[PDB]
A = this chain, B = another copy of it.
Amino acid sequence: MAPYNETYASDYAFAYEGMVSDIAPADIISRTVETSAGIGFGKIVAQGTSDRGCKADVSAVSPTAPPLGITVRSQATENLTLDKYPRYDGAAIMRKGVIWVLVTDAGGVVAGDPVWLKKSDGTFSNADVGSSGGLRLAGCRWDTSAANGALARMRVDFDVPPVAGA
């Protein structure tokens, strides 16, 4: 009977942090979490050192060492970390479907835009940062107009090599 965090919303929300939207194709890949803390749901991941592991640290990704994919919302995750994949757990990375993610940009994004990754934190945006600290995920595009700090769905394809931007 818990009425806390009641906002009396006009209508239903759109999605959650890492939920997918149904479509026939999806590469979902099982990896093992390597970071000491968990990994959030809609997040980018790099290639681990365990030959099948992944890390949440993408500060050193390059066109030669591209990022691995994006985690998905699992909803059965050990109930000790709130919404995360705990250490030593199947990660369920996705690299082909359409997924809801979080926007980090001042002016927001619109339907068809490039997707730029900020290597410092691992956040998605519309344009390059400008100090050799951003990559462009070459095969990727948005699918929703959204403001700053809101959820937008994007279409992703990680087999296309990334592009470095200074």
Residues of A whose CB lies within 8 Å of any CB of B are 23-28, 47-49, 51-52, 64-66, 68, 96, 110-112, 114, 138-141, 144-145, 155, 157, 159-161
> Please, how many angstroms separate the alpha-carbon atoms of A71 and B134 in the complex?
35
Sorted nearest first, the 8 A-B pairs with minimum C-beta distance are A157-B159, A139-B159, A47-B112, A51-B111, A138-B161, A47-B111, A160-B160, A51-B145
- Kindly list chain B residues whose C-beta atoms are within 8 Å of the C-beta of A112: 47, 65-66, 68
Q: Is the interface of A mostly helix, strand, loop or mixed?
A: loop
In whole Å, how far is A8's beta carbon from the nearest beta carbon of chain B? 27
Q: Is the CB of B139 within 8 A of A96?
A: no
In whole Å, how far is A4's beta carbon from the nearest beta carbon of chain B? 34
> Please, how many angstroms separate the alpha-carbon atoms of A23 and B52 in the complex?
16
- Kindly list chain B residues whose C-beta atoms are within 8 Å of the C-beta of A141: 66
Q: Is the CB of A25 within 8 A of B96?
A: yes
In whole Å, how far is A27's beta carbon from the nearest beta carbon of chain B? 6
In whole Å, how far is A162's beta carbon from the nearest beta carbon of chain B? 11
- Kindly list chain B residues whose C-beta atoms are within 8 Å of the C-beta of A111: 47-49, 51-52
Most chain B CB within 10 A, of A23, A27, A66, is at A27
